[PDB]
Design a protein that fits this description.
The chain folds into 2 domains: 1-32 and 93-175, Rossmann fold (3-Layer(aba) Sandwich), CATH 3.40.50.300; 33-92, Guanylate Kinase phosphate binding domain, CATH 3.30.63. The chain contains 6 helices and 9 strands. The protein has helices at 16-26, 54-62, 81-89, 103-106, 131-147, 160-174; strands at residues 5-9, 31-32, 37-38, 50-51, 66-72, 75-80, 93-97, 113-119, 153-156. The strands form 2 sheets. Strands 2-7-1-8-9 form a 5-stranded parallel beta sheet, sandwiched between helices. Strands 4-3-6-5 form a 4-stranded mixed beta sheet. It is found in: Nucleus; Cytoplasm; Cell membrane.
Length: 175
């Protein structure tokens, strides 16, 4: 693989979770998702989470071993670079639905990302113009006008099945 990581940028709720899970479910021999590490007491280590002590996670973060990290209910969660490496070592493409900040560490030969921006729909006959859609479109626009330098491809998510097909075709070509 020339490109080993499919990075999906986009506003929260634009559909990246459905897209990511569908791609892996469809092609589990092609894609994988790096599960997070957490300091939340456990489950099975390595199933949905890797369990780590607070001190160990902090030491690893300080040593720049994490791609992303955050806190929730007195606990910490993060995606470790090593987890992505494991996927690559198996000849699989890692799918990462992350914030643009993650690209600082991901944009190297080691991870070789293909960065796709999944944009909010412009055709919305089935969606109420409520707070959720307005915020989705606002956030999508902020991302689009701020981080466009880093996009390899943009797909407007008007038809989610088409978005998935386009990603499959792009990956077949570029990765």
């Amino acid at each position: 693989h020339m490109r080993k990581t499919l990075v999906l940028l986009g506003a929260h709720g634009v559909g990246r979770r459905h897209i990511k899970n569908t791609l892996i479910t469809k092609h589990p021999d092609r894609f994988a998702y790096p599960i997070p590490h957490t300091t939340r007491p456990p489950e099975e280590n390595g199933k949905n989470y890797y369990f780590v002590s607070h001190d160990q996670m902090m030491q690893d973060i300080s040593n720049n071993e994490y791609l992303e990290y955050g806190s929730h209910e007195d606990a910490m969660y993060g995606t470790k670079l090593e987890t992505i490496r494991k996927i690559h070592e198996q000849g699989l493409i890692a799918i990462l639905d992350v914030e643009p900040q993650a690209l600082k560490v991901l944009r190297t030969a080691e991870f070789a990302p293909f960065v796709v921006f999944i944009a909010a729909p412009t055709i919305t006959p089935g969606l109420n113009e409520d707070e959720s859609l307005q915020r989705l479109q606002k956030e999508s626009d902020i991302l689009q006008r701020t981080y466009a330098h880093y996009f390899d491809l943009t797909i407007i998510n008007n038809e989610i099945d088409e978005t998935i097909r386009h990603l499959e075709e792009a990956v077949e070509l570029v990765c």
